[PDB]
């Protein structure tokens, strides 16, 4: 609400937005409480250390005054954290456990994966920036490997990055140039992307063998857990011994 | 077209695996979102981010992997114009591991297994 209601980079107080001071207010008043309570209350253990921290960051404005970049860069970190440390609270419905279960098996496999594959971008992307120099999406070693990363998704660039240059004699390296682009292709949008859809489609196909185990064994460890922790005269009034149905 | 001898078998894996895709997003729904909300911050003055709504729809867009990179990211920041350069580059090399690669071949991966 603090978000969609204020221009991102605008500074706010609960006195107003720099150019819904009660909404304002008790939105601010609402995320600083659930900061402190939050750490009260205290990967899943360091996504919480990460949204209270920023939290309080975003709304600190209600007491000391923050320039307005840091009130909006770390209200853009907590807003992100939020939502995905919300998928860790889906996990305990039996409709959505199992798809952030295969959601989280596939992250891992590809986090394990990545220290071999992160030296195969680091070569094309060296590569091209000796062969493509002189274009602006490889002017510096970091942007030729962001922009090798964001090719691996098959978005080449071919006809604004090799032929409309080498049609112009802009290509400095133009038989070289060509020959690295035909096996890039080759290694990168075809053989790695289809090596992370292979380990993709062989695990969750593992998930699946026992999905249908797998619900209802992450409710009985979510009921238990409960049933350890809650006060043995409420389970003594709450459990009755038989339960009627009428289909 | 369902009544057909060599038509239905397609039409009953349409069903299965769009009610598979439907059952899964009410959990990446919050996926997009959190991405959503967070581009809106961090790329707020480009036309595709001007609205939290146009933010969704622009990432729901780049599930295909059409990122559109050079411009959105590396035109902008080869002219200053990237209120957050460094935080708005690290969260596109993450939205890209999560959304295009990961969500993606996660729906390859139950689209195979059901049919
Ligand atoms: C583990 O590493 C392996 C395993 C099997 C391999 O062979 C299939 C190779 N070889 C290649 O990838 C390769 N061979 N030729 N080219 C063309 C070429 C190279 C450098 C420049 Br610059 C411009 C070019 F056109 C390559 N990309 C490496
Ligand atoms: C279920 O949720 C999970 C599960 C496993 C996770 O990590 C292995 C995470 N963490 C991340 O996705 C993450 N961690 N760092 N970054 C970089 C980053 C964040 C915010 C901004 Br704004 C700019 C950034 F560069 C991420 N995108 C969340």
Redo the contacts with the bound molecule.
């Keep these: 609400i603090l978000v969609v209601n204020i221009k991102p980079g605008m500074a706010f107080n609960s006195t107003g937005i720099i150019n819904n001071s009660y909404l304002i207010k008790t939105c601010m008043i609402l995320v600083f409480l659930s900061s402190i309570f939050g750490y009260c209350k205290e990967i899943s253990n360091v996504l919480e250390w990460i949204i209270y921290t920023t939290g309080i960051i975003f709304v600190l404005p209600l007491f000391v005054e923050i320039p307005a970049h840091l009130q909006w860069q770390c209200g853009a970190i907590a807003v992100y954290f939020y939502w995905m440390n919300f998928l860790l609270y889906l996990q305990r419905f039996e409709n959505c456990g199992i798809f952030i279960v295969m959601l989280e098996v596939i992250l891992k496999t590809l986090l394990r994966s990545t220290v071999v594959f992160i030296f195969l971008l680091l070569a094309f992307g060296l ?1 091209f920036y000796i ?1 493509l120099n002189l274009q602006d999406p490889f002017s510096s070693p970091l942007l030729s490997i962001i922009q090798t990363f964001s090719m691996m998704l098959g978005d080449i660039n071919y006809r604004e990055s090799f032929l409309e240059p080498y049609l112009r004699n802009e290509l400095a390296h133009p038989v ?1 140039s060509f ?2 682009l035909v ?1 890039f292709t080759i ?1 990168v949008p075809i053989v790695l992307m289809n090596l992370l859809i292979g380990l993709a489609v062989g695990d969750i196909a593992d998930v699946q063998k026992h999905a249908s185990l797998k619900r209802i064994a992450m409710q009985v460890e979510l009921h238990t857990s409960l049933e350890k922790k809650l006060p043995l005269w409420f389970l003594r009034k709450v459990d009755q011994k038989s339960t009627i149905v009428y289909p």
């Design positions: 590569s062969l070289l020959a690295q096996s290694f």
